[PDB]
Amino acid sequence: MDSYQTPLSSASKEMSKLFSSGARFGTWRKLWLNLAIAEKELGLAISDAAIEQMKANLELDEAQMKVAAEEEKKRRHDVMAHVHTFGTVAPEAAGIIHLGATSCYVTDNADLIFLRDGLDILLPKLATVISRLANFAKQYRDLPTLGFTHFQPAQLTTVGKRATLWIQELLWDLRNLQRARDDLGFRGVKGTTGTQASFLALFDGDHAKVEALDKRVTELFGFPYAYPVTGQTYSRKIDADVLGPLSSFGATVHKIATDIRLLANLKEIEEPFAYKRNPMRCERACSLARHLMAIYQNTLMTSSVQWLERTLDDSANRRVTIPEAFLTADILLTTLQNISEGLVVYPRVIGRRISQELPFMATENIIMAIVKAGGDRQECHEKIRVLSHQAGAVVKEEGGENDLIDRVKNDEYFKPIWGQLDALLDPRTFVGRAPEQVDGFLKEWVEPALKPYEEAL
């Protein structure tokens, strides 16, 4: 109340918890526990009792945080403060906690755990959004709606088809973020400058024991491999290769929400549940998507000036940039989830706009109809052009409705097509392959993509 609190955590509690202090130091302890287990397996002198005391004390409490804070004020080393504090509650382990490791054994491996786990929180939520939009697209596959290019009237599309543009961008995000998560390895045990010198000495020169230790702690946290070559840290390029995809997802969210905000002004599509309504979720979505787009630059700059085996100018920036990116991404997915469940469509508003704009785009159909009934193209083209100009002036210069079809209905020249005119201007015949395109897309791209998330009800 007397200090600034980031609105990004005050938000799913699950993502917020992932990047909480309790989780950070708890994960350090899990790392210390598992290092001990793996070293003990490889023959180092670590008692059973040491393991049991550590296993039971993986979670910090406020009293221990106070011991840690006080130790840290003294020596100004957060990792050693927490080595010490772990040792007060697991006295039997006090001498072997962190054995052989450098600071990054916990700070960096925890961060890789949070990237991986954080991505595992995002991915089912993204799949949920994709699924709800896909249902919406299917439902509205063949509802004609005015096309827009330059945000000006254009060949009709369908409400469904337009939604598949949104879905297609999100499918690439699913692709990109699944890769980013699957590409992640474990730093494991690497030592102060990445040479594993302390662990090699610990195992009395046994290279295979060092390699086995690295593989073991990797396996214990569910990672597919240990990084083969590092300095002190995992490469900060890895942060860029995760937040890059996140920034692209930001652009996707921003476009989708901007589209709905335009459609809401047009009273055609609105957010789920008053005559006047503001697309507030979409506006919030855009606002935070923009943050996700900007924050990526931090990772590029950080990676670009990491000198040699590591410089510490990565640390403070990453404590901000990594949690905020994942919190923001998580808030966006939650917001999109709320938006996509029950989008409100107004077919009669959509239909009205089509009736006001389509006749200016149907003038070639009229010519074709006249010619087929034995008329002259150049004669019809000129007549319909005159009437189009007149109707255009009523709209723009008189602020009236489009009376082009009335003018045709009143002009005896068009007698050979009066009978077919309503069929001739049937919006369903103007949407090209839009409905078929939806069908193929949902079957060939969306459903295979959603298949690994099928357990989601």
Tokens of 15: 């993502």
Measured CA to CA, the distance from residue 135 to residue 450 in angstroms comes to 12
What is each CA distance from 185 to 8, 108, 112, 147, 227, in whole angstroms? 28, 12, 8, 46, 6
Residues 393 and 286 in one domain: no
Residue type, 126: L
- Select from 344, 345, 347 the least CA-distant residue to 427: 347
Residues 51 and 146 in one domain: no
Does residue 357 lie within any of the structural domains?
A: yes
Measured CA to CA, the distance from residue 25 to residue 85 in angstroms comes to 10
Measured CA to CA, the distance from residue 391 to residue 358 in angstroms comes to 12
Give Dmax (Cα) for the chain.
Answer: 104
Point out the domain boundary residue: 73, 99, 125: 99
By the 8 A CB rule, do 296 and 324 touch?
Answer: no
Q: 3-state secondary structure string, the chain?
A: CCCCCCCCCCCCHHHHHHCCHHHHHHHHHHHHHHHHHHHHHCCCCCCHHHHHHHHCCCCCCHHHHHHHHHHHHHHCCHHHHHHHHHHHHCHHHCCCCCCCCCCHHHHHHHHHHHHHHHHHHHHHHHHHHHHHHHHHHHHCCCCEEEEEECCEEEEEEEHHHHHHHHHHHHHHHHHHHHHHHHCCCECCCCCCCCCCHHHHHHCCCCHHHHHHHHHHHHHHCCCCCECCCCCCCCCCHHHHHHHHHHHHHHHHHHHHHHHHHHHHHCCCEECCCCCCCCCHHHHHHHHHHHHHHHHHHHHHHHHHCCCCCCCHHHHHHHHHHHHHHHHHHHHHHHHHHHHHCCCEECHHHHHHHHHHHHHHHCHHHHHHHHHHCCCCHHHHHHHHHHHHHHHHHHHHHHCCCCCHHHHHHHCHHHHHHHHHHHHHCCHHHCCCCHHHHHHHHHHHHHHHHHHHHCCCC
Cα 17–chain centre separation: 19
Does residue 1 lie within any of the structural domains?
A: no
Residues 81 and 152 in one domain: no
Residues 199 and 52 in one domain: no
Point out the domain boundary residue: 50, 84, 99: 99
By the 8 A CB rule, do 163 and 367 touch?
Answer: no
> What CATH number is attached to the domain comprising 221?
1.20.200.10
**Resolution of this entry in Å?**
2.1
Tally of domains within the chain = 3
By the 8 A CB rule, do 423 and 98 touch?
Answer: no
Judged on CB neighbours under 10 Å (0-12, 13-18, 19+), 435 is middle
Residues 303 and 398 in one domain: no
Judged on CB neighbours under 10 Å (0-12, 13-18, 19+), 399 is exposed
Q: Please state, as a whole number, how many other Cβ atoms lie within 10 Å of the Cβ of residue 31.
A: 22
Cα 253–chain centre separation: 8
Give the strand pairing for 344-345 and 269-270. antiparallel
Residues 55 and 179 in one domain: no
Measured CA to CA, the distance from residue 427 to residue 435 in angstroms comes to 13
Residue showing tokens 């991505």: 119
By the 8 A CB rule, do 396 and 123 touch?
Answer: no
By the 8 A CB rule, do 363 and 388 touch?
Answer: yes
CA dihedral 422, 427, 429, 433 (to 10 degrees): 180
Q: 3-state secondary structure string, 405-436?
A: HHHHHHCHHHHHHHHHHHHHCCHHHCCCCHHH
By the 8 A CB rule, do 354 and 156 touch?
Answer: yes
> For the chain, how big is the Rg over CA atoms in Å?
31
> What CATH number is attached to the domain comprising 393?
6.10.250.1570
Residues 349 and 251 in one domain: yes
Return the exposure string of 211-244: e unless at least 16 CB atoms fall within 10 Å of the residue's CB, then b.
bebbbbbbbbbebeebbeebbbbbbbebbbbbbe
By the 8 A CB rule, do 348 and 268 touch?
Answer: no
Measured CA to CA, the distance from residue 204 to residue 387 in angstroms comes to 95
Point out the domain boundary residue: 99, 120, 137: 99
Residues 156 and 281 in one domain: yes
Residues 398 and 434 in one domain: no
Angle at 127 between CA 125 and CA 133, to 5 degrees: 105
Measured CA to CA, the distance from residue 213 to residue 188 in angstroms comes to 8
Residue showing tokens 């052989």: 100
Residues 283 and 426 in one domain: yes
Measured CA to CA, the distance from residue 428 to residue 223 in angstroms comes to 52
Residues 24 and 107 in one domain: no
Q: Please state, as a whole number, how many other Cβ atoms lie within 10 Å of the Cβ of residue 204.
A: 8
> What CATH number is attached to the domain comprising 91?
1.10.275.10
Q: 3-state secondary structure string, 316-375?
A: HHHHHHHHHHHHHHHHHHHHHHHHHCCCEECHHHHHHHHHHHHHHHCHHHHHHHHHHCCC
Residues spanned by the domain of 280? 100-375+417-457
Tokens of 379: 């004669």
Measured CA to CA, the distance from residue 140 to residue 159 in angstroms comes to 6
What is each CA distance from 385 to 156, 360, 376, 381, 414, in whole angstroms? 21, 10, 14, 6, 13
Measured CA to CA, the distance from residue 138 to residue 163 in angstroms comes to 9
Tokens of 273: 């549940």
Measured CA to CA, the distance from residue 253 to residue 258 in angstroms comes to 8
Tokens of 160: 């469904």
Measured CA to CA, the distance from residue 247 to residue 232 in angstroms comes to 27
Measured CA to CA, the distance from residue 233 to residue 103 in angstroms comes to 10
Does residue 246 lie within any of the structural domains?
A: yes
Residues 155 and 288 in one domain: yes
Residues 6+ apart with CB under 8 A from 49: 92
Judged on CB neighbours under 10 Å (0-12, 13-18, 19+), 167 is buried
Cα 96–chain centre separation: 41
Q: Which residues pair with 270 in a beta bridge?
A: 344
